[PDB]
Design a protein around this ligand. Structure first.
Ligand SMILES: CN1CCN(S(=O)(=O)c2ccc3c(c2)S(=O)(=O)N[C@@H](C2CCCC2)C3)CC1
Ligand SMILES: CN1CCN(S(=O)(=O)c2ccc3c(c2)S(=O)(=O)N[C@@H](C2CCCC2)C3)CC1
Ligand SMILES: N[C@@H](CCC(=O)O)C(=O)O
Ligand SMILES: N[C@@H](CCC(=O)O)C(=O)O
Lengths: 258, 263
């Protein structure tokens, strides 16, 4: 029957269409992952229903209860059959769910308000005037918590105890804070989202330095799901036909910034 | 059920796998050095197995003969049960994914253009709109298949030309392509992966360079025979090494740390 797809409202991957309130079903959404889902579904020959993840989180495991939340949790507990969104492939997640080869590449990066005197992660670590944080329940936060790299280790030690909290519930709130903090707050987010933001009004944000790591997003399915194989082959076909590149160019590259 | 030495197939391709100086008096795995030599050691340590490095017999990556339907190169070694795992710059592709297993990528790359410094060429577009400068790719690899299969105008145009060019514009090894670029006084441009291109750009006599953006985006993956029990473990090993930052360290080690062109 119908494949239940869990995804998340994150621009430009999944966004509510203008006048969505009178729309219904899958027609309510638009974005990179909306088009991707349609392409995958066609190649694998299945019907699907897009659903926004209940708690609006990507996926993290509670150290105490050891329960998974976000989209990872919905796959693990059988609430969804597949996840098509900017879900990062990580070791801890790979041990509980299946992932296709990556359909998009990215790396943790730094977002600053134009003019901020910061050029790297190291610069941030050696000062305290400018505050910096990350998104909660995501791979970026986990990256800093787990790093044994001096600089990142130092940055984590600071972030985890900073008051007020430097962590945000959503990417949009992280961006908002950078823009509204007169340069006293830098945000650590993935390059894909960073580059999308610096492309639009009011064109006051900027990505500085190189990415801290190199990785990618993958389409996830419950461990052992029979859907996995077909989806992986589909991702590779779309990659080779150059369709994944076309979708990126479509949803990312305006002119209201210069 | 007893553990036995894992047979690793790989290819002599710098800086992934190279003959160590004094190799003529060394034996086994000690005869080699390189990015994939270090990677194989890391993977083995993490997966807890012993291994034997074996240079692929025909010196090819892997392609299937349209008529006999037989696979050659490293892919053939895995498919026909000659090797237990492949650790080398083997590109993850659809046709290969259909016959063998691949871990998540351990290195990213894209098809690129290598030119002799000074050559008046900035893109694949430039190459397709002229005939003074010849150009080609490596045989039996993903790059040649890319042009053969492209439905994109400019790439289709390049393939129509390359496939019929005389003398042949294709080479059997990367080394042969590099020498052709270096000796053709700017009359030959070579299409190869960004990884190999960037490595050579750091090698003496520093007379070549990468131009334009990459034509595509993909990566190399560690391969195993389809259904092999070794696959799960090595994939997790690749992700761990990735997150510990080791992979980035190895890239810098063999590519830039000791480049011979300064900077
Ligand atoms: C310069 N940019 C590089 C990244 N690409 S991209 O749209 O993010 C893209 C497109 C296709 C693929 C990737 C990224 S990827 O993350 O490197 N994964 C590849 C696959 C294809 C072979 C197995 C890895 C497909 C856009 C252009
Ligand atoms: C700026 N360079 C980018 C490429 N890296 S790299 O050494 O080739 C490298 C290192 C680790 C990984 C890659 C590439 S990758 O091809 O994008 N694959 C990633 C994995 C990690 C999550 C699943 C994809 C690991 C070196 C630095
Ligand atoms: N893509 C991340 C969320 C964003 C972030 O952590 O920066 C994840 O899958 O957890
Ligand atoms: N990495 C390629 C070989 C090099 C090339 O085709 O340019 C392959 O696995 O086929």
């Amino acid at each position: 029957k119908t494949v239940v797809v869990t995804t998340i409202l994150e621009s430009p991957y999944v966004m509510m269409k203008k006048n969505h309130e009178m729309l219904e079903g899958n027609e309510r959404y638009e974005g990179y992952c909306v088009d991707l889902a349609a392409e995958i579904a066609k190649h694998c020959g299945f019907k699907y229903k897009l659903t926004i993840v209940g708690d609006g989180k990507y996926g993290a495991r509670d150290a105490d209860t050891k329960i998974w939340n976000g989209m990872v949790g919905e796959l693990v507990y059988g609430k969804a059959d597949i996840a098509i969104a900017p879900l990062t492939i990580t070791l801890v997640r790979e041990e509980v769910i299946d992932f296709s080869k990556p359909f998009m590449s990215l790396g943790i990066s730094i977002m600053i308000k134009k003019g901020t005197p910061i050029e790297s992660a190291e610069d941030l670590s050696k000062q305290t005037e400018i505050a910096y944080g990350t998104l909660d329940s995501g791979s970026t936060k986990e990256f800093f918590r787990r790093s044994k790299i001096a600089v990142f280790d130092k940055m984590w030690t600071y972030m985890r105890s900073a008051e007020p909290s430097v962590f945000v519930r959503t990417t949009a709130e992280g961006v908002a804070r950078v823009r509204k903090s007169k340069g006293k707050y830098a945000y650590l987010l993935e390059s894909t989202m960073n580059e999308y933001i610096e492309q639009r009004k009011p064109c006051d944000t900027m990505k500085v330095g190189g990415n801290l790591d190199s990785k990618g997003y993958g389409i996830a399915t419950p461990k052992g799901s029979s859907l996995g194989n077909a989806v992986n082959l589909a991702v590779l076909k779309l990659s080779e036909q150059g369709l994944l590149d076309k979708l990126k160019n479509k949803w990312w590259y305006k002119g209201e910034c210069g």
